[PDB]
């Protein structure tokens, strides 16, 4: 009785690592579907050959044509694959807010959603939550996987605080003036790396924490931990903190999300306490790095505001990577877009509501770029 797994974004870092965990664990997992964008066809063809899975979605029509025998092709390909494939688990490792429809489709099938695409939850907000049963979304994000594990340390009424760790990025300790000169070269993928550096990733993760676990924003702490060995912690009402620790390796949270609640033997190397190490903690410099506070503000506003936060980032980040704006302008644009986003506090009733909010935010972010 193997779990049938659909892997969305199969050719990316998380996707390939997931396929490796599945290949190492044939008694527990079986691949039944693959989805890819179409930029890494070499990898996709190998994946088809090795897994024997022809049930494949390709987003780019030209790429799907170039390949051949692809049953699902076009922008809605991944969504239709999910809708029409019998599965126990959908791993959503697509990139960006475009993971939204496949996330909704997955939840509506009743399968466990192993979520790597944090953007679909951040953007979807209550719309995504209303489609899910309790515990149906299982995080692949390292911090949230850690939180889920640490929450086993007590009952829900015993939780005082959730403590999200953050690497601090390559610019930890830098001044506001220092960040002016940051180049795209200095800052997994281009977006994952950049969002880490700008602290917008951590803002997205704070929102993700609130939505997954239902804890109020004022009880979600962020601490900088440069070693990235402690992946997050939960503080309980008696003063006890339970923390999860492991050498960085996404195969650990991937494996746990795929097989929840059961741990997968040998998924990753454990901390080695026969060698010296230091786990350091320091407060986030919120003045220099206000992305987390902006996320909290968007989160408290709720409705479609978190979709706005993410959409504004996607556009500003693209502008930065293209050499059009400076590094500090990323969070500057997000703030400008949010201040103008009055009407988006309304709760999304349909996917179209979220899409409307994102459309508006993308336009407004472009407006903000044009004024620079």
CA–CA distance, 109 with 102 (Å, rounded to integer): 11
CB of 116: closest distance to Mn ion in angstroms?
Answer: 9
Find out whether 206 and 299 touch, Cβ atoms under 8 Å: yes
Q: What is the DSSP letter of 136?
A: -
Spatial strand order in the sheet of 137-139? 72-73, 56-58, 29-36, 3-8, 89-92, 112-115, 137-139
Closest CA to 255 of 67, 23, 10: 23
Task: Answer yes or no whether residue 141 interacts with Mn ion by CB under 5 A.
Answer: yes
Of the pair 263, 324, the CB lying nearest its own copies is at: 263
Task: Answer yes or no whether residue 270 interacts with its own copies by CB under 8 A.
Answer: yes
Of the pair 117, 255, the CB lying nearest its own copies is at: 255
CA–CA distance, 1 with 125 (Å, rounded to integer): 33
Residue nearest to Mn ion according to CB distances in the complex: 141
Task: Please report the sign of the dihedral spanned by the C-alpha atoms of residue 219, residue 222, residue 225, residue 230.
Answer: positive
**Rounded to the nearest 5°, which phi and psi values hold at 224?**
-85, 130
CB of 142: closest distance to Mn ion in angstroms?
Answer: 5
Task: Answer yes or no whether residue 208 interacts with Mn ion by CB under 5 A.
Answer: no
CA–CA distance, 226 with 132 (Å, rounded to integer): 34
Task: Answer yes or no whether residue 167 interacts with its own copies by CB under 8 A.
Answer: no
Task: Answer yes or no whether residue 318 interacts with its own copies by CB under 8 A.
Answer: no
Task: Answer yes or no whether residue 62 interacts with its own copies by CB under 8 A.
Answer: no
CB of 256: closest distance to its own copies in angstroms?
Answer: 7
Task: Answer yes or no whether residue 23 interacts with its own copies by CB under 8 A.
Answer: no
Among 154, 302, 326, 332, the residue binding its own copies under the rule CB under 8 A is 154
Find out whether 144 and 212 touch, Cβ atoms under 8 Å: yes
- Per-residue contact string for residues 236-255; x = within reach of its own copies by CB under 8 A: xxxxxxxxxxxx-x--x--x
Extract the tokens encoding 208: 């993700």
Q: Which does 278 bind (CB under 5 to 8 A by kind): Mn ion, its own copies, none?
A: its own copies
Of the pair 117, 244, the CB lying nearest its own copies is at: 244
Task: Answer yes or no whether residue 233 interacts with its own copies by CB under 8 A.
Answer: yes
CB of 221: closest distance to its own copies in angstroms?
Answer: 6
User: Could you tell me where the beta strands, DSSP code E, fall in 29-166?
Assistant: 29-36, 56-58, 72-73, 89-92, 112-115, 137-139, 159-166
Strand partners, 36: 58
**CB neighbourhood size of 132 (10 A):** 19
Task: Answer yes or no whether residue 343 interacts with its own copies by CB under 8 A.
Answer: no
Of the pair 175, 241, the CB lying nearest its own copies is at: 241
**CB neighbourhood size of 49 (10 A):** 9
Among 71, 153, 184, 328, the residue binding its own copies under the rule CB under 8 A is 153
Helix, strand or coil, per DSSP, at residue 74: coil
Extract the tokens encoding 307: 């979709």
Torsion of CA 268, 271, 273, 276, to 10 degrees: 120
Q: Which does 141 bind (CB under 5 to 8 A by kind): Mn ion, its own copies, none?
A: Mn ion
Helix, strand or coil, per DSSP, at residue 358: helix
Listed ranges 95-103, 142-150, 286-294, 321-329: which one lies at the site for Mn ion (CB under 5 A) = 142-150
Binding residues for its own copies, how many (CB under 8 A)?
52
Of the pair 85, 92, the CB lying nearest Mn ion is at: 92
Listed ranges 139-147, 159-167, 256-264, 298-306: which one lies at the site for Mn ion (CB under 5 A) = 139-147
Binding residues for its own copies, rule: CB under 8 A, are 149-150, 152-155, 158, 160-161, 163, 221, 223, 230, 233, 235-247, 249, 252, 255-256, 262-271, 273-283
Binding residues for Mn ion, rule: CB under 5 A, are 141-143
């Amino acid at each position: 009785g193997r779990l049938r797994v659909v892997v969305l974004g199969s050719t990316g870092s998380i996707g390939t690592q997931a396929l490796q965990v599945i290949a190492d664990n044939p008694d527990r997992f079986e691949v039944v579907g693959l989805a890819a964008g179409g930029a890494h066809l070499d990898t996709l063809l190998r994946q088809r050959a090795q897994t024997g899975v022809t049930n494949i979605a390709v987003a780019d029509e030209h790429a799907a044509q170039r390949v051949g025998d692809i049953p699902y092709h076009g922008s809605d390909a991944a969504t239709r694959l999910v809708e029409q494939t019998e599965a126990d688990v959908v791993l959503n490792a697509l990139v960006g807010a475009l993971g939204l429809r496949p996330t909704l489709a997955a939840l509506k099938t009743g399968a466990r959603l192993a979520l790597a695409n944090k953007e679909s939850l951040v953007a979807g907000g209550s719309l995504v939550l209303r489609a899910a049963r309790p515990g149906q979304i299982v995080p692949v994000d390292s911090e949230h996987s850690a939180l889920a594990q640490c929450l086993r340390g007590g009952t829900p009424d015993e939780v005082a605080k959730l403590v999200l760790t953050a690497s601090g990025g390559p610019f930890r300790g830098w001044s506001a003036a220092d960040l002016e000169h940051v180049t795209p070269e200095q800052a997994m993928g281009p977006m994952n790396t950049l969002n880490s550096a700008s602290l917008v990733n951590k803002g997205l993760e704070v929102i993700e924490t609130h939505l997954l676990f239902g804890i109020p924003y004022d009880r979600i702490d962020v601490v900088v931990h440069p070693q990235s060995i402690i992946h997050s912690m939960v503080t309980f009402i008696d003063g006890s903190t339970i923390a999860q620790a492991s050498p960085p390796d996404m195969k650990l949270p991937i494996s746990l999300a795929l097989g929840w609640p059961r741990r997968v033997s040998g998924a990753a190397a454990a901390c080695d306490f026969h060698t010296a190490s230091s786990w350091e903690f320091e407060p986030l410099d919120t003045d220099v790095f206000p992305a987390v506070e902006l996320a909290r503000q968007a989160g408290v506003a709720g409705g479609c505001m978190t979709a706005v936060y993410n959409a504004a980032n996607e556009e500003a980040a693209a502008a930065f990577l293209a050499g059009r704006i400076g590094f500090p302008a990323i969070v500057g644009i997000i703030a400008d877009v949010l201040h103008a986003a009055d009407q988006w506090a309304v709760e999304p009733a349909t996917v179209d509501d979220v899409l409307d909010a994102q459309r508006w935010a993308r336009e407004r972010a472009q407006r903000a770029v044009s004024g620079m």
